[PDB]
């Protein structure tokens, strides 16, 4: 009950997938500082589990996490805002293979070495795990080996370089990189696209509905197109902005989590 507050407002995220990442991070840190009206520090961690645990335990004010970890810690978290990409707050998981790989569909990946992105990513893990669960298999049964690359861009590199025969990646990442690193991406192709799911949201700890810091962060995200600097960050990410959503937008993820739970 003695309150504990941080020395600065902290916004957590996982590493940005772009090549000029320090530039995007600097502009985003500047934007949020400018919009919130006091210093904001960006805290990057490698994995979704680390970002999420920091947020749940009160060591961040907000964080950009995946819908999967959000749904896992749903009672301890509140949604702040969801990104818009190509006009909509949704995205797909892609199952990718080498550009010239001679195969017809998903079942031909049996026996592959498979690159997943993060065990707490919807698009880098859970969707593919759902395909497998529905057919009575798990990654250890279906693939000869699988591994986590801890980044979507890294899945693409692992498949492009031939260390993995197939991989599971965020379809937003793959499409954005198709334009920013076209020579890299041209070494892969999309074998399977999933259904649409809610785009990875920004969330806050549930004890913080009343927090002035959370409210200002929320307005900063929602108003990000109103400022030159905010537009600049959005342009580099190819996002359109942020919108308000509710947990219902993440129901297709929760439904897949339940399908996977019911695998033996």
Numbering used by the authors: 41 to 304
What does the report in the manuscript say about this coordinate set?
The regulatory cluster consists of three genes, aioX, aioS and aioR, which encode a periplasmic-binding protein (PBP), a sensor histidine kinase and a response regulator, respectively. Arsenite-bound AioX is thought to act as a ligand for AioS, the sensor histidine kinase that upon auto-phosphorylation, phosphorylates AioR, the response regulator, which binds to a conserved sequence upstream of a RpoN promoter. AioX exhibits a typical bilobed structure of the PBP type II class. In this class of proteins, the ligand-binding pocket is located in the space between the two domains.
While the majority of both structures overlay very well, there is a significant difference in the rotamer conformation of Tyr88. The change in the side chain conformation is further associated with the backbone shift for residues 83–88 and a significant conformational change in the loop region comprising residues 53–61, demarked by the black circle in Fig. 5A. It should be noted that while surface residues 59–61 in the arsenite-bound structure are near the neighbouring molecule in the asymmetric unit, they are too distant to be directly involved in the interactions, while in the apo-AioX Asp61 interacts with the side chain of Arg281 from the crystallographic symmetry related molecule. These small differences in molecular packing support the idea that 53–61 loop conformation change might result in the generation of a new protein interaction surface. The fact that the arsenite-bound and apo-AioX crystals displayed differences in molecular packing (forming weak local and crystallographic symmetry related dimers, respectively) supports the idea that loop conformation change might result in the generation of a new protein interaction surface.
